[PDB]
Design a protein around this ligand. Structure first.
Ligand code: A1CLU
Length: 165
């Protein structure tokens, strides 16, 4: 099971960890991907998770988009977790660097409530351009299921813990 996490609330936990290495160790039921609407897993968490699957995540994702079309910003889909997890929940938070509505971040986190326990990154943070302190706040005030947050950047992790209300 999950180990070394700091408890933030009744149901939100956090750790300074690479989510790929955490997923390989834990093999959780659900790993969350910080996806875009096209499921094009180029960089950030998505590029790292896809590379760890030897591109099998991207091949599966291209078939999903060919059948269903793009996701909505704020939406999600459940696909295989490949060698990392049973399932991957691909969730699209708004990308501030592409000019998307930050109010859609709450809708993005609501997708987590469909799963009893998840390993996840902070949505819309990193290369998606939103303030990670805000993302953590929306996570705590939205998700009611058990979420284990993996924060890869050590300096960000320390800032998120020290500023957490
Ligand atoms: O936690 C971070 O440092 C940022 C915040 C938004 C997500 C990003 C991240 C998370 C896990 C990652 O695992 C490999 N690369 C990763 C990047």
């Amino acid at each position: 099971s999950f180990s070394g996490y700091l408890k933030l609330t009744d149901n939100v936990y956090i750790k300074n960890a690479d989510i790929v290495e955490e997923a390989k160790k834990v093999k959780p039921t659900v790993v969350v991907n910080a996806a875009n609407v096209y499921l094009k897993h180029g960089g950030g968490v998505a590029g790292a998770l896809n590379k760890a699957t030897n591109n099998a995540m991207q091949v599966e994702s291209d078939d999903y988009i060919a059948t269903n079309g793009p996701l909505k910003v704020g939406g999600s889909c459940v696909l295989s977790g490949h060698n990392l997890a049973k399932h991957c929940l691909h969730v699209v938070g708004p990308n501030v660097n592409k000019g998307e509505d930050i109010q859609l971040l709450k809708s993005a986190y609501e997708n987590f409530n469909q799963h009893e326990v998840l390993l996840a990154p902070l949505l819309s943070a990193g290369i998606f351009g939103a303030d990670p302190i805000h993302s953590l706040r929306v996570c705590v005030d939205t998700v009611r299921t058990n979420v284990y947050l993996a924060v890869f950047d050590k300096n960000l992790y320390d800032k998120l813990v020290s500023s957490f209300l």
